[PDB]
């Protein structure tokens, strides 16, 4: 009834999607062939007799990553028309993603979305997975969002984003891509959940005792967070939260729509046996800065909203108690305009564990979505990075060559300046 459409854009989006759909299948008892020997239905449509198909679109501008899906273990899971590939990628260029290359498949992508949406009776909205740094993740995603805003209007749209790290980059032009896509998507997105690869790696190393975490591990971790967000819709719970509720409770002003995700507990089986994981204990873990999935310092910022989504063997009174004590704590300061800062969800289903996964099986988990003035720091950093390169017009010719105009760069930058000032203004007390 309450269907959710998932869109996976570019390598990051697709690979994360692989991890998400693998998890969903295990959670609902769906085999890699679509068969199972009613809850599934928000994520899977059902066809004929004994087959379930993801309510998903996977898109990339090059064939390689999606070709893996096609030839892989879950080849039978997806219908061929929901796996969309072009010929040439966006080459870390927003312009190519948004204009030159993207305009060739946008119509196709949207057509398939329309077909998906036509088989929904109670569409809740869209979950869009992508990165800030890639030409597809940045340029194509922005394009897509624009179209969706026009064709679907006030339907809720949510983003999961691989936000660039402070000192861990892949591409040189990441700042450009990040800035432009943020500028173009800002007025079209209702809430965007930032996540940072550096932070997740640290978590893997520190909390899971993994010497060398791979992208796979990160993807798996992300899948947990996503599951927590949608478990309230896929399962029965004591106290429930739906996709429409987040943007109401986490976004205080239209532009300030960047909450951050934190998941607890992340432990190995060897380490789990010597610990009893109470609600208080996991909440405390969450509210400590080292377990955050963005490399930023909340102690230097203020909280504007916290949303805590508990799952498994969890009792409301206990949660209340846990929260109360965290409220007292010196390291948790909230903005002065917000005496009520907590939204709490509690679901009965314990977190499901992927066979051969890095995480141990626990009776309880929690996923916090929190919005903090500390994010301003990241924006400031990104702006600085942009400034350094743009002052020399480094790489600019590429963007212009793909049909972008130089004035649009300055436009993007000024918009981001404004955004930065908005955060600052919000920060101060009345």
């Amino acid at each position: 009834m309450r269907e959710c459409i998932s869109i996976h854009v570019g390598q990051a989006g697709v690979q994360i999607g692989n991890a998400c759909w693998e998890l969903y299948c295990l959670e609902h008892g769906i085999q890699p062939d679509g068969q199972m020997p009613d809850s599934f239905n928000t994520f899977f449509s059902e066809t004929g007799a004994g087959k379930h198909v993801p309510r998903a679109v996977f898109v990339d501008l090059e064939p390689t990553v999606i070709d893996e899906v096609r030839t892989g273990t879950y080849r039978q899971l997806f219908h061929p028309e929901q796996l969309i590939t072009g010929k040439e990628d966006a080459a870390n260029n927003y312009a190519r993603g948004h204009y030159t290359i993207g305009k060739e498949i946008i119509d196709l992508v949207l057509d398939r979305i329309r077909k998906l949406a036509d088989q929904c009776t109670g569409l809740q909205g869209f979950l869009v997975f992508h990165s800030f740094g890639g030409g597809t993740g940045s340029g194509f995603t922005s394009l897509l969002m624009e179209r969706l805003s026009v064709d679907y209007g006030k339907k809720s749209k949510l983003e999961f984003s691989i936000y660039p790290a402070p000192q861990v980059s892949t591409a040189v032009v990441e700042p450009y891509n990040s800035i432009l896509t943020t500028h173009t998507t800002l007025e079209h997105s209702d809430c965007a959940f930032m996540v940072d690869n550096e932070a997740i790696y640290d978590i893997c190393r520190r909390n899971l005792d993994i010497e060398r975490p791979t992208y796979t591990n990160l993807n798996r971790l992300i899948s947990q967070i996503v599951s927590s967000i949608t478990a309230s819709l896929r399962f029965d719970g004591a106290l429930n939260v739906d996709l429409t509720e987040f943007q109401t409770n986490l976004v205080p002003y239209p532009r300030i729509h960047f909450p951050l995700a934190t998941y607890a507990p992340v432990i190995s089986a060897e380490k789990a046996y010597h610990e009893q994981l109470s609600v208080a204990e996991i909440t405390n873990a969450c509210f400590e800065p080292a377990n955050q999935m963005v490399k930023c310092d909340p102690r230097h910022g203020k909280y504007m909203a916290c949303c805590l989504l508990y799952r498994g063997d969890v009792v409301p009174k206990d949660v209340n108690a846990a929260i109360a004590t965290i409220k007292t704590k010196r390291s948790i300061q909230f903005v002065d305009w917000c005496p009520t800062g907590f939204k709490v969800g509690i679901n009965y289903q314990p977190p499901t564990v992927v066979p051969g996964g890095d995480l141990a099986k626990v009776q309880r988990a929690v996923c916090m979505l929190s919005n903090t003035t500390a994010i301003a720091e990241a924006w400031a950093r990104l702006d600085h990075k942009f400034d350094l390169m743009y002052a020399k017009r480094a790489f600019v010719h590429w963007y212009v060559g793909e049909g972008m105009e130089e004035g649009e760069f300055s436009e993007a930058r000024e918009d981001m300046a404004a955004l930065e000032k908005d955060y600052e203004e919000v920060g101060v007390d009345s």
Partner: protein
Amino acid sequence: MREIVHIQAGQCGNQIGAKFWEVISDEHGIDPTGSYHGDSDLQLERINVYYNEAAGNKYVPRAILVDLEPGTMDSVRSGPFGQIFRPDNFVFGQSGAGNNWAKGHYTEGAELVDSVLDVVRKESESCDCLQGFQLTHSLGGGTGSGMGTLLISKIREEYPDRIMNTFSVVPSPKVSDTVVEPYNATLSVHQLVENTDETYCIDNEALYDICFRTLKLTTPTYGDLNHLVSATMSGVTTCLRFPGQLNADLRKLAVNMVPFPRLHFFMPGFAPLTSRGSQQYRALTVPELTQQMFDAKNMMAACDPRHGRYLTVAAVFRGRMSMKEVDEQMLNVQNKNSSYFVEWIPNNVKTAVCDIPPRGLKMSATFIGNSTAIQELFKRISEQFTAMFRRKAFLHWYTGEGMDEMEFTEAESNMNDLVSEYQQYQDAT
């Protein structure tokens, strides 16, 4: 003869409601299918107060279940007693309100309300002599608060001479369950002040305290909390449904408890309440019950009655007990606690006695206090509202649904006036 129409809005409203229904069915000897398997003719005599009689010796709750999301409804249907409800009385949307009062009152709720109203009217017409309506819901969410208030408004318009009573789950002081709950509560209260005849204020903070401290429940669950509420609820209508020695009803209680129209917000309480092991070490005499009733730790609203004064108190007793004793106890409480009772309402304790005790107990008591201390709660909400509204925080979520600042402002003002009124009577000599 005195039909009550039951209405349930949102997750909270439906969870409490289900529990209430379960309680009532057991009392009247009704099983999960609607069949009577009780012992005594007294159990069926006034069964029409809550149940319609269907064909083939079945009884169906005069209950309407409403929500903008279907999951809760589904859960209810799948629960023990889920099959007793009339299928056509479940009225659910697909969208939800996203914890937004505006969506519940003006948008999504608006789209669903007519369907509810149609059912309600039919139910009303079923009844020979409709007493009125009882609504279970929260003030902090979007459906129970916005849609619920809308429903109330329409019902009142249709049936202005019938009683409207509500069991409202109010926001807690120490921790908030949602970020916008002050807005949602404040708006809701605006409607409630003008459109309900009586409102039972129930607070989860108080409930948890009761469960942990008094009931000795290490880890109470929402079900347990709901049970307490259900017990209170059943208590208020007991004199309507069974013969008694001094019989109360909803109208009488309202008359006794509400000296001025706006001051109809009660702090409900229930006695006795004991642990599993601790019950063998004490006898349930009437004085003990009375003592249990009259203290701050046993109130289901998060406010200390010792911070204000009682305008009125209604006590409803169930079981075979001595009227003289009861009267003595009532006198005694008044005399010894003189400073907690307003001086310009003499004999401000009302007593009712119903001969039928609840199941498992030989006697029980239900307390309804109209205390000026409830103003504290309102003040807190006003403060929280102000803090947010002065900076227009989250406002675009409501204005986006067509609401204007003026409405907010007026609501705030009304709330403030109520507080002032409460203060005035607290301070009067």
